[PDB]
Amino acid sequence: GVQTHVLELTSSVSAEKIFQGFVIDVDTVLPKAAPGAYKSVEIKGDGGPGTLKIITLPDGGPITTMTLRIDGVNKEALTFDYSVIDGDILLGFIESIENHVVLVPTADGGSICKTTAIFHTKGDAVVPEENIKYANEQNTALFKALEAYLIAN
Numbered sequence: 001g002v003q004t005h006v007l008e009l010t011s012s013v014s015a016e017k018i019f020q021g022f023v024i025d026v027d028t029v030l031p032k033a034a035p036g037a038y039k040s041v042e043i044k045g046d047g048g049p050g051t052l053k054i055i056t057l058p059d060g061g062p063i064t065t066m067t068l069r070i071d072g073v074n075k076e077a078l079t080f081d082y083s084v085i086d087g088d089i090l091l092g093f094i095e096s097i098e099n100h101v102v103l104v105p106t107a108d109g110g111s112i113c114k115t116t117a118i119f120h121t122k123g124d125a126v127v128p129e130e131n132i133k134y135a136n137e138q139n140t141a142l143f144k145a146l147e148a149y150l151i152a153n
Contacts, residue, residue, distance in 0.1 A: 003119045005132050008112060009143050013150050015078050015103040015111040021150050022101075022113075023073060023080045027053075033149030037142060048073055055087075062134075063089045078103035093125040113143070 011018060021029045027043060039058055045051025053068040067086035072079065084090065084097035098118040103111055117135075119127050 001121055001124055001126070003121065003127055005117050005119070006114065007117075007136055007139060008114045009140065010106070010110065010112050011143075011147050012108070012110040013147060014109060015105045017150055018111055018113060018147075019075075019078045019080070019103050021146055024075070029146060029149065034142065034145040037145065045070070063087070065089070091131075093121050094127070095120045095122055115139075 021033075027041070027047075030037065036058065038055055040056040042054045043051065044054075047070070049070055049072055051070045053070075055066050055068065057063055057065070065087035066084055066089040069083045069085050071081035071083055074080075080101045082099050082101075084099075090096070098120065099115060100118075101113060101115040103113055105111055121127060
């Protein structure tokens with residue numbers, strides 16, 4: 001089946017500036033801004049659609065591996081699409097995770113980042129509240145960590 005979850009994040013940073021650090025220069029900003037968030041990266045592809053990012057997570061955690069495909073990048077739209085296609089983040093039950101992120105400017109000079117995740121499970125399988133809640137808890141922490149760095153520099 002198919003299940004949708006949305007997360008919305010407001011920052012005091014411009015959409016241009018976030019989109020930049022989060023999408024375009026992310027392979028450079030991640031490591032500077034939050035070194036312990038991950039462990040290793042191989043990136044096969046130029047950067048645009050089709051590009052694979054094989055990620056490895058810190059030793060003593062639940063999940064160890066996750067692989068990302070970039071589906072689309074629209075610089076003019078501040079839009080970014082990526083899927084999780086592989087790794088043990090999918091547990092047994094999850095075929096893929098289809099994500100869509102949208103930046104929108106606000107009147108105070110900041111931004112809203114709406115990311116929409118769409119879990120493609122097998123059969124009638126449903127993703128528990130606890131697993132989705134762990135990703136929000138975690139994903140937020142990553143956003144706030146980058147954000148911090150973006151403000152400083």
